[PDB]
Amino acid sequence: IPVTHIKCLRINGQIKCVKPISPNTTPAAEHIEHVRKNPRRKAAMDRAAARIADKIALKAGGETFVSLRMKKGFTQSELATAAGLPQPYLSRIENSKQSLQDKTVQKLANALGVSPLEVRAAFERRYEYME
């Protein structure tokens, strides 16, 4: 039953203790990136993503955040890059997160070229409402 002291970053009303190590370029990521560099390959993938996004929308109640990302032809990696976000954080936005800050909605809206309302409406499909 021990105690140990760790250095943490306090940056404007927010504590950051965890330092996730950041080597963006991993072989699997590197691979898909090279595959998508061919426009003919990219399209083939895109059409598959769209078809799968339909199955997601129907299954889930309507357009989800992932669903929408897929129909616009963005891999999670591509969208993360387009929207000035880290991919881990984007993964959380697609799967785990309960809300989005306004600034993020806008970054994402711009990246995908759709309205804030669209982004927000998609995000909110992870819930089950009742009226």
Nearer to ligand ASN, 74 or 123 (CB): 123
Q: What angle do CA 58, 115, 42 make, to 5 degrees?
A: 65
Residue nearest to ligand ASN (CB): 9
Nearer to Cl ion, 4 or 26 (CB): 26
Name the token pair of 33.
């990136």
Rounded CA gap, 124 and 126, in Å?
5
Ramachandran angles phi, psi of 16, nearest 5°:
-125, 105
70 binds its own copies (CB under 8 A): yes
Nearer to ligand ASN, 19 or 40 (CB): 19
Q: How far is the CB of 5 from ligand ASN (least distance, A)?
A: 11
Which window, 59-67, 100-108, 112-120, contacts its own copies (CB under 8 A)? 59-67
Residues facing residue 10 across a β-bridge = 15
Rounded CA gap, 105 and 66, in Å?
14
Rounded CA gap, 80 and 51, in Å?
22
Chain residues that interact with its own copies, rule: CB under 8 A: 4-8, 17-21, 23, 25-28, 30-32, 35, 45, 48-49, 52, 55-56, 59-60, 64, 66-67, 70, 75, 77, 88, 91-92, 94-98, 126-131
